[PDB]
Design a protein around this nucleic acid. Structure first.
Ligand code: GTP
Ligand code: MG
Ligand code: MG
Ligand code: MG
Ligand code: MG
Ligand code: MG
Ligand code: MG
Ligand code: MG
Ligand code: MG
Ligand code: MG
Ligand code: MG
Ligand code: MG
Ligand code: MG
Ligand code: MG
Ligand code: MG
Ligand code: MG
Ligand code: MG
Ligand code: MG
Ligand code: MG
Lengths: 45, 191, 189, 41, 176, 139, 117, 97, 26
RNA sequence: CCUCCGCAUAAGCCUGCGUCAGAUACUGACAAUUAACAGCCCAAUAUCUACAAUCAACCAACAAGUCAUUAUUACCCUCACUGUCAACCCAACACAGGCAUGCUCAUAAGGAAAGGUUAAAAAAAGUAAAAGGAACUCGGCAAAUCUUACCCC
RNA sequence: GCUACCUAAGAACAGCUAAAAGAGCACACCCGUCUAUGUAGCAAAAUAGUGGGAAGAUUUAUAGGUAGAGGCGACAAACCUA
RNA sequence: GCUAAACCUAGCCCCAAACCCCACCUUACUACCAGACAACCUUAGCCAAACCAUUUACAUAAAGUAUAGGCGAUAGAAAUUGAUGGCGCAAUAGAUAUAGUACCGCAAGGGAAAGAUGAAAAACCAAGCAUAAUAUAGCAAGGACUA
């Protein structure tokens, strides 16, 4: 019954975890900064 | 090349080299003393003498130089024997294969004295840089086509058609080819 | 590939001495060396042959590589690996003498030797499989030596076997030669 | 790992030698051989 | 014609095709702008032919005859481009004094990193461009801590590299 | 041209001209049956079909009747020893139909060792009668 | 769910796939009814020269002298182009010698560059 | 099996290199030099523990006091946490009280 | 690898003893 | 013999049973999906736009409803770009699960329940059963039939 | 991106009885009454049968919104990425 | 005799010194249209006080002194004084790091493993088993015994 909570959709993906949304708020800017400091190959989604 | 790549007898880009050093090898690096480019004194074709190992004393001709590992390969000297073309049935043919020698194990030979010599990179007024033997002086010299349908003749290649001018290639070509443009480029904003 | 393989021998004999004019080749040899003697060669060739076969007896590959060429060493050692050979030269019936000489540049000398030798080849387990350790046998052979013309020397290159050569000594063990391993569809002919 | 034990082989053998004539894993596994050897002594 | 995309029919199938030397920058510098303009298309046609040969060789699972001439042609085209760029740069410096052909400016991005923002071409001024105004070219105070952290990460990496180099040098000296 | 900023065009401005073309194309053998008048090219991704038409008509004087393009996706499934996907580059494929009834067919391109061969000829494989006894000895 | 793969026009719904491109420079605009108006002036015009009689083959003969590399500089260009006229008119208003006060009014403006390649 | 099967490469120690040969020299600089220099001034090392000794908590406190402002951000955070933990351990835990 | 020499030396002696036992000399 | 299906679009995925060669629905190489279908639109300033849909005709309504321009000024002179493959997606899996829409309403399309043997117990699913017919059981649970009447909430 | 509720603009509901019905039988579809199996399972809640609704307070695709001292809730202390 | 065993250097730790072409904020990595929207505002709590509620640390010497403090747990000055590498690690260690990669999660985020020939490749030892299943009786051993 459970397990399939991920119903993929690129519109939702980019509108929820995209670069633009991450930069929209100061908190998301700090999220991107944390990813950069850690060296993540994927800063945003 | 991958970090700490182990230079071998095979060239760094051959099939045998790729077989011996796949991308995932992490062998211990080889410790090689840092001989500067201005201190390297062994060159391809130089006559040398072997100081250590089998064939010690014999003098040969340097065929290959692996600088990254301070290696000189003396042609037909310091040879072991290996089979080439050995298949499931045929034993193959024995071939003499040279083994690399270190520049500390190999010394240059005087052009005429035919004896091992110590070398210095003494400057000369004419030969700005050239090898000079120390124990007996004398300079050791450094050893060592038809145009196709798609090759420029020498005179055409060296012809100086360039007349310097305050014109860009674009406008010069426009004048040469006769393209006439009257429209004025409207100014744009940069930011 | 700037570097190339530096061979120390040739693939095979230049001109085969068909067993029962070469002064140009002798001249070339002398102009390359300046101290060679055709008349004195046979003794040196015999010494080289005896030493090479004693090296085979003692499994001295290092000395073999100096006494025989790279076209000779595999032929001598491949089939004798993992077995012991008790070879011994007892005497030379008639004196050895040069026969034919021909010539980056190699020179080949054919020497006819009619000598007397002994053989005893044992298995991995020390079981005799060829010859007698003591009985001597008369052997007529044509050894072709070769030399490379700075640090080269005279080394055995080949052995020419006459088509009229007497059959070699028979083997101790019996042999089975399978016939055509026919597939089911195939039929014997 | 400034200081590490390098004699553990011999420390184990000092007991396994007395445990060699036992049955089962008591003659091979130190965790068992030590108990069996202590009981034997 | 399409035949210009392939080598000479006589050369077809040849194991090796002899080729001259790649054009050198000094040699090209002596040629006029029109001459360089024509040589550019000569080399472009040769490059197209050689790329066609390479792709067909890959398709046929065979080595490309004389692969070095493709590198020679690429080097010649690069040298011609460099010569033309040098002439254009010299003229631009003489006439305007600008060392860059494209306008740009050193700006601090939203992450506090100093970048060279290369200006784009627009029809309306920046104060009216909506998207440009959405783009932010300033770092707020909360970015200072991350700037310090990145600086310290870089310093740690550099210190590790230098210490390792000194260790290796000492090992080499002891060995020799 | 590619990897260059195009001068922005405003109404009534001058024609956009490129003097030293940066596009390099490949003429490739079609992988499937094609009409006699169709030629297949591999093109830089930044080249439009209009650009290809002008390119062929100016540099090669090839009369082009029609051009179609498609972006072939290169496989990203392959993985290296580090389990990182190796990306085969995507490339643009252009199908060009020649004009004036002209026909094109891809040309049929591609229409020490001595010592090794000599020794192989001189193998002298072992005789079964010998029963493994070495053949060098003449006794 | 794939973050390490490049974002291309082949990924996403119909709107995303239609909207994203592959780097090809624009040729015109869109009007009512999605009709595309292509502007000729926006199409790059390949200025291909006449190669007839051209003597420069793609490759150079190996029997050619080697010369030291001397990258062209502003000073060298000035010396080779303007200096002679300056000397002549000094022995005997820089626009006469060639200086252009402003790039505006030129078809090929050096800065900001407004021409291809 | 945690024992190597081959002897390790011989370890040769030059007992008469310069460092060992001149070790201890100028340790009596004070008493033999009119006390111009204290022997602790011969100590080369971290600035916060030159001629000074203490337990881990004291060493951490001294490090923070003397070079805390020059420490990296995460290193200083780690030092603060270590000082906190050492304070708690030394002032609230132990057999003796 | 564990730094040290004496344990390795002892193990070498034990290996020599085992080798002798397995292949006693004439 | 089965057919829940199936074929497309959407969404998702991203080359994931095409060819060649090596191995032992894998690996490497080669090839491929071609726009008309779909996405990617619209020059301004004002000014218009009461009267559902339901075969829209009678009727009946209530919950009161997806579907419209004009006036002047501008403006044509020049068909790009992107998706197009697959045995596919979300469920750690070649997962008996989840999965929108258009047709097909049993198929023209798509598939195989049995690796071979034997035919023990116990276990699961099903079928048949003398006479009896709830005597079972907490209870007619299950199964079989199609079955009345009275209460509590 | 599940789920609770909501916003925008969409889609689906065979056949029969009745007749403008939060009507009846009954598909698709939604749900999950009871039994059996399963219980490291096909499944971290399924399968087979059986059953409730199935023109509505229905179901459902897309995008958006409400965030933890909170949200949302036909209150089950429900649901808010097992 | 198979699984396997080992190995030495990849690097790292602590100090000193020293200050450090094009594309991309729209669905990032997207050539090319009227914006207007802009940042600052006490840390808290765990925990200790054996609960918890005020409270509870974040060069040397003066000095744990003056003081503060449910005057108790604890907190705590100032005046004043004068100020060149490694008895480090060596692949379960040392950085998480071969890498913030693979993989996992919608996301924030979490986060691995491992390699060893030689100058040149253009040359005997853990467990587990097998050799070799088993003989009445039993913490499997001890005393023993010819066994
Ligand atoms: N304590 C310590 N001394 C170091 C360190 N790095 C270098 N040194 C010392 O620096 C001195 C000079 O180092 P060298 O490499 O010989 O010379 P250099 O490159 O001129 O030195 P620097 O100026 O320090 O970079 C020697 O005494 C080294 O021991 C380090 O990390 N710690
Ligand atoms: Mg959903
Ligand atoms: Mg298309
Ligand atoms: Mg089956
Ligand atoms: Mg079965
Ligand atoms: Mg009955
Ligand atoms: Mg009853
Ligand atoms: Mg009844
Ligand atoms: Mg009863
Ligand atoms: Mg029932
Ligand atoms: Mg109905
Ligand atoms: Mg109803
Ligand atoms: Mg309640
Ligand atoms: Mg309750
Ligand atoms: Mg408390
Ligand atoms: Mg307590
Ligand atoms: Mg003070
Ligand atoms: Mg580690
Ligand atoms: Mg064992």
């Amino acid at each position: 019954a459970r397990g399939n909570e991920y119903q993929p959709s690129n519109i939702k993906r980019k509108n929820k975890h995209g670069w633009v949304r991450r930069l929209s708020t100061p908190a998301g800017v700090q999220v991107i900064l944390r990813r950069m400091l850690k060296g993540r190959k994927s800063l945003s989604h | 090349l991958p970090p700490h790549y182990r230079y071998g007898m095979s060239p760094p880009g051959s099939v045998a080299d790729k077989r011996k050093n796949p991308p995932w090898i992490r062998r211990r690096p080889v410790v090689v003393e840092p001989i500067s480019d201005e201190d390297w004194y062994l060159f391809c074709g130089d006559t040398v003498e072997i100081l250590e190992g089998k064939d010690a004393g014999k003098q040969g001709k340097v065929v290959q130089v692996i600088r990254q590992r301070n290696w000189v390969v003396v042609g037909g000297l310091n040879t072991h024997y290996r089979y080439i073309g050995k298949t499931m049935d045929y034993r193959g043919t024995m071939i003499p294969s040279e083994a690399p020698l270190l520049h500390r194990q190999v010394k240059l030979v005087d052009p005429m004295d035919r004896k091992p010599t110590e070398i210095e990179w003494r400057f000369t007024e004419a030969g700005e840089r050239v090898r000079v033997s120390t124990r007996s002086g004398r300079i050791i010299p450094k050893p060592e086509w038809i145009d196709g349908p798609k090759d420029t003749s020498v005179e055409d290649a060296l012809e100086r058609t360039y007349v310097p001018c305050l014109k860009t290639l674009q406008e010069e070509v426009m004048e040469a080819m006769g393209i006439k443009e009257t429209r004025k480029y409207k100014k744009v904003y940069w930011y | 590939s700037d570097r190339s393989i530096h061979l120390a021998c040739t693939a095979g004999i230049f001109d085969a001495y068909v067993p029962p004019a070469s002064q140009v080749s002798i001249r070339r040899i002398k102009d390359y060396d300046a101290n060679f003697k055709i008349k004195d060669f046979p003794e040196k060739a015999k010494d080289i042959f005896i030493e090479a076969h004693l090296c085979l007896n003692n499994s001295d590959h290092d000395r073999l590589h100096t006494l025989v060429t790279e076209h000779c060493f595999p032929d001598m050692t491949w089939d004798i690996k993992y077995k012991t050979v008790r070879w011994s030269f007892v005497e030379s019936l008639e004196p050895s003498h040069v026969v034919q000489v021909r010539c980056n540049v190699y020179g080949q000398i054919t020497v006819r030797m009619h000598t007397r030798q002994t053989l005893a080849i044992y298995d991995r387990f020390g079981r005799l499989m060829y010859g007698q350790e003591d009985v001597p046998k008369d052997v007529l052979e044509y050894v072709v030596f070769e030399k490379q013309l700075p640090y080269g020397s005279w080394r055995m290159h080949t052995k020419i076997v006459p088509p009229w050569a007497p059959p070699k000594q028979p083997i101790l063990k019996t042999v089975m030669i399978p016939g055509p391993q026919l597939k089911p569809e195939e039929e014997y002919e | 790992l400034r200081n590490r034990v390098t004699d553990r082989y011999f420390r184990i053998q000092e007991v396994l030698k007395h445990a060699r004539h036992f049955r089962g894993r008591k003659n091979r596994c130190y965790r068992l051989a030590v108990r069996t050897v202590i009981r034997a002594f | 014609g399409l035949e210009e995309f392939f080598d000479d029919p006589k050369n077809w199938g040849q194991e090796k095709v002899k080729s001259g030397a790649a054009w050198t920058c000094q040699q090209l510098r002596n040629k006029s702008n029109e001459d360089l303009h024509k040589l550019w298309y000569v080399l472009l046609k040769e490059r197209n032919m050689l790329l066609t040969l390479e792709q067909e060789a890959k398709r046929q699972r065979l080595p490309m005859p004389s692969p070095e001439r493709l590198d020679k042609v690429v080097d010649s085209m690069d040298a011609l481009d460099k010569v033309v760029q040098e002439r254009e740069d010299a003229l631009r410096l003489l006439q305007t004094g600008q060392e860059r052909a494209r306008p740009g400016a050193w700006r601090r991005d939203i992450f506090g990193r100093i970048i060279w923002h290369k200006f784009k071409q627009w029809v309306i001024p920046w104060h009216l461009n909506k998207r440009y105004n959405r783009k932010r070219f300033f770092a707020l105070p909360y970015v200072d801590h991350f700037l310090r952290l990145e600086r310290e990460k870089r310093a740690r990496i550099k210190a590790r590299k230098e210490n390792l180099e000194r260790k290796k040098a000492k090992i080499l000296l002891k060995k020799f | 041209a590619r990897n260059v900023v195009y001068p922005l065009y405003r109404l009534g401005g001058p024609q956009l001209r490129v003097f030293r073309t940066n596009f390099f194309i490949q003429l490739v053998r079609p992988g499937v049956a094609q009409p006699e008048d169709t030629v297949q090219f591999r093109i830089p991704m930044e080249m439009t079909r209009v650009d290809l038409r002008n390119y062929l008509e100016g540099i090669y004087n090839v009369p082009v009747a029609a051009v179609r393009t498609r972006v072939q996706h290169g496989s990203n499934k392959r993985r290296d020893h580090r389990n990182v996907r190796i990306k085969k580059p995507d490339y643009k494929v252009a199908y060009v139909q020649l004009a004036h009834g002209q026909t094109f067919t891809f040309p049929d391109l591609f229409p020490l060792y001595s010592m090794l061969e000599e020794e192989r000829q001189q193998r002298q494989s072992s005789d079964p009668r010998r029963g493994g006894v070495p053949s060098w000895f003449g006794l | 769910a794939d973050r390490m793969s490049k974002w291309t026009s082949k990924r996403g719904p119909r709107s995303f796939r239609g909207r994203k491109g592959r780097g090809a420079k624009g040729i015109g605009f869109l009007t009512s009814g999605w009709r595309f108006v292509q502007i000729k002036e926006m199409v790059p015009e390949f200025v291909v020269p006449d190669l007839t009689g051209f003597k420069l083959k793609p490759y150079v003969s190996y029997l050619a002298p080697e010369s030291e590399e001397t990258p062209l500089t502003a000073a060298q260009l000035f010396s080779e182009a303007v200096a002679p006229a300056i000397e002549k008119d000094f022995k005997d208003n820089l626009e006469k010698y060639g200086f252009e006060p402003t790039q505006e009014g030129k078809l090929f403006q050096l800065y900001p560059r407004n021409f291809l390649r | 099996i945690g024992i190597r099967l081959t002897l390790p490469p011989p370890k040769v120690v030059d007992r008469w290199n310069e460092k060992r040969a001149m070790f201890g020299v100028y340790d009596n600089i004070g008493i033999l030099g009119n006390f111009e220099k204290h022997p602790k001034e011969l100590i080369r090392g971290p600035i916060w523990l030159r001629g000074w000794k203490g337990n881990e908590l004291q060493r951490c406190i001294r490090k923070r006091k003397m070079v805390g402002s020059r420490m990296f951000a995460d290193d200083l955070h780690n030092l603060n946490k270590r000082i906190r933990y050492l304070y708690k351990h030394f002032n609230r835990h132990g057999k003796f009280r | 690898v564990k730094k040290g020499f004496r344990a390795a030396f002892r193990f070498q002696k034990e290996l020599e003893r085992q080798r002798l036992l397995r292949c006693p000399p004439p």
